[PDB]
Ligand binder design. Structure first.
Ligand SMILES: *[C@@H]1O[C@H](CO)[C@@H](O)[C@H](O)[C@H]1NC(C)=O
Lengths: 223, 191, 214
């Protein structure tokens, strides 16, 4: 089975460097080229680098402007990519692939890439704000409430409701990268508006990167 | 008939250079194998497998090779894919049988056994019962390859990676395809 | 260099349906093209190469035709595990170039979104920023439109939206639109309205509130 294991992704500031590794097994590493393919956050595959069998030929995307250098050690069945002068646009999940023009990626479960996150922000825990339901902007016996998890870095946060008791009708939206360099998402849940004053609605926001947990009670907005 | 020389045989050829053996002038009993319950795959197309050795053919060909489980479904009438298009093809009017069994205990090896090759590149597809040993540098780009490997110029044969701790779909399987030829000639292979 | 263009970029279909994806190249590439499948979050997997031959292990429902500049990927009877994004690549030259991908979605009948609007909390206004939220709950298809009106003044450039994945149970989408303003710009106005244009709506639905009311 073709097993390709990526490692080395992380948080680097703009201008910094990083070196990614790809451990290979299950085939004759010497008979194939090797390619690095990145994928930005929800944006599809972009081939970035190519290295020959004996590493006597190396090819790149000119967009990179010589910032990336591909390498390979055959004794160790290993591929390497040195990423220099990193830009924010380089944030992506990087995969290595066995290459013969055709790309074979790593078989499950081994092959799954490494995540490079290039940002000038230091890690901050989120601020949770209640998206309170109103009796005016209701909808036929059903009312929606939620939590706005704003201004955090990096990904991810996890959000539950009532410590797991409230699951039906929960929508946790994908995080959006704000102009400030910080992420923010929101988690909403719809519940019978008849049982507002009776039922308690707590949202649990867990940001493991910053070692932060927040329990926020969303009360119906009474002016 | 010497079926033990084909099935219980020691060495098997890889699928790109599969092994054909001619069989004539002997008495064969098929129901010894189908009722042996020793194979993982035993599919017969054309003739009924159930005790229909009441026939006489001119020649009997046995084609042996090694593939992986994922590819066993390709040794069948009218199938398409890497092995069928590039390695071993059977015709739609197939009057024969295909047998296959898991050989993970004999063809795997720690750190991988890379002794079995498969053709991964070819300009066209294989006609029924064709056989291609052409190690010509396959051309995938505009540049002619001029017999040397390089940028967009790949070697056609590639190894199998038979580690023993593979999933079953990736494990080695031995395949024997039996063809029954009845031409305008004296038939000698009966049961 | 070589450009790849895929059609239709987003395709909705049902289980058992026959599906075709098209991929065209800005110049000829003979049959040196391959087709890959990527499920959300996972790594891409090679389905077909040489325009037509199935890589071993791939279900035979996948097939490919074409040459020159034109290629078609065909799934005979769509199964639930086939809903994913699909990419095409060429291995004729460098840089290796992919198609933009076509997402295969689940086909269901049209459904109108449940629309809600949320004013900024008092704590966030205390912090110095105001985030007004608009929610489109459980609709189909994915394509919708949100516009913000601050005292019936159309906004642009200060809103960000994100959408969920198609639901595992009823195959709907839900979308969140967030309008970000300074505490000043928020406290300068009264009526905040969210206008939703969707196929399952005969007319655009506007949900609004007034500043500090309730
Ligand atoms: C192969 O070995 C088995 C082991 O008992 C034997 O029964 C059989 O006759 C041999 N030959 C064939 C063709 O199976």
């Amino acid at each position: 089975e073709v097993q390709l294991v990526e490692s080395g992704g992380g948080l680097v500031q703009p201008g910094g460097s990083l070196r990614l590794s790809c451990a290979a097994s299950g085939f004759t590493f010497s008979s194939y080229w090797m390619s690095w393919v990145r994928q930005a956050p929800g944006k599809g595959l972009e081939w970035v680098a190519n290295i020959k069998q004996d590493a006597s030929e190396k090819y790149y995307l000119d967009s990179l402007k010589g910032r990336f250098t591909i390498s390979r050690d055959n004794a160790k069945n290993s591929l390497y990519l040195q990423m220099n002068s990193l830009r924010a646009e380089d944030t992506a999940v990087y995969y290595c692939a066995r290459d013969l023009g055709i790309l074979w990626f790593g078989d499950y479960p081994w092959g799954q890439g490494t995540l490079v996150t290039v940002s000038s922000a230091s890690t901050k825990g989120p601020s949770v704000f209640p998206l309170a339901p109103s009796s005016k902007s209701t909808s036929g016996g059903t009312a929606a409430l939620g939590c706005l998890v704003k201004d955090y870095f990096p990904e991810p946060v996890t959000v539950s409701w009532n410590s797991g008791a409230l699951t039906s009708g929960v929508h946790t939206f994908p995080a959006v990268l704000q102009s400030s360099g910080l992420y923010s998402l929101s988690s909403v849940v719809t519940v019978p508006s008849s049982s507002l004053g009776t039922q308690t609605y707590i949202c649990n926001v867990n940001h493991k990167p910053s070692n932060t947990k927040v329990d926020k009670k969303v009360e119906p907005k009474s002016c | 008939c010497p079926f033990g020389e084909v099935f219980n045989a020691t060495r098997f050829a890889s699928v790109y250079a599969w092994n054909r053996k001619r069989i004539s002038n002997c008495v064969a009993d098929y129901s010894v194998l189908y009722n042996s319950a020793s194979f993982s795959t035993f599919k017969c197309y054309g003739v009924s497998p159930t005790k229909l050795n009441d026939l006489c053919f001119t020649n009997v060909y046995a084609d042996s090779f090694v593939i992986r489980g994922d590819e066993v479904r390709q040794i069948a009438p009218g199938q398409t894919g890497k092995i069928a298009d590039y390695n071993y093809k059977l015709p739609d009017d197939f009057t024969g049988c295909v047998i296959a069994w898991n050989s993970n205990n004999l063809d795997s090896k720690v750190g991988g056994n890379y002794n079995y090759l498969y053709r991964l590149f070819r300009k066209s597809n294989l006609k029924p019962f064709e056989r291609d040993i052409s190690t010509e540098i396959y051309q995938a780009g505009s540049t002619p390859c001029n017999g040397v490997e390089g940028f967009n110029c790949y070697f056609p044969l590639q190894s199998y990676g038979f580690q023993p701790t593979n999933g079953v779909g990736y494990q080695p399987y031995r395949v024997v395809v039996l063809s029954f030829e009845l031409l305008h000639a004296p038939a000698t292979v009966c049961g | 260099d070589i450009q790849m263009t895929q059609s239709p970029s987003s395709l909705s279909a049902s289980v058992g349906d026959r599906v075709t994806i098209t991929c065209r190249a800005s110049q000829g590439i003979s049959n040196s093209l391959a087709w890959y499948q990527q499920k959300p979050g996972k790594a891409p997997k090679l389905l077909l190469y040489a325009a037509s031959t199935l890589e071993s292990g791939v279900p035979s429902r996948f097939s490919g035709s074409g040459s020159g500049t034109d290629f078609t990927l065909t799934i005979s009877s769509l199964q639930p595990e086939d809903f994913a994004t699909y990419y095409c690549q060429q291995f004729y030259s460098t840089p290796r170039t992919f198609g933009q991908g076509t997402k295969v979605e689940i086909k269901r009948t049209v459904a109108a979104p449940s629309v809600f609007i949320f004013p900024p909390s008092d704590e966030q206004l205390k912090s110095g920023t105001a985030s007004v939220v608009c929610l489109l709950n459980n609709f189909y298809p994915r394509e919708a439109k949100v516009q913000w009106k601050v005292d019936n003044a159309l906004q642009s450039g200060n809103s960000q939206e994100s959408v969920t994945e198609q639901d595992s149970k009823d195959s709907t989408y839900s979308l969140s639109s967030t309008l970000t303003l300074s505490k000043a710009d928020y406290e300068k106005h009264k009526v905040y309205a969210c206008e939703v244009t969707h196929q399952g709506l005969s007319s655009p639905v506007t949900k609004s509130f007034n500043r500090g009311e309730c």
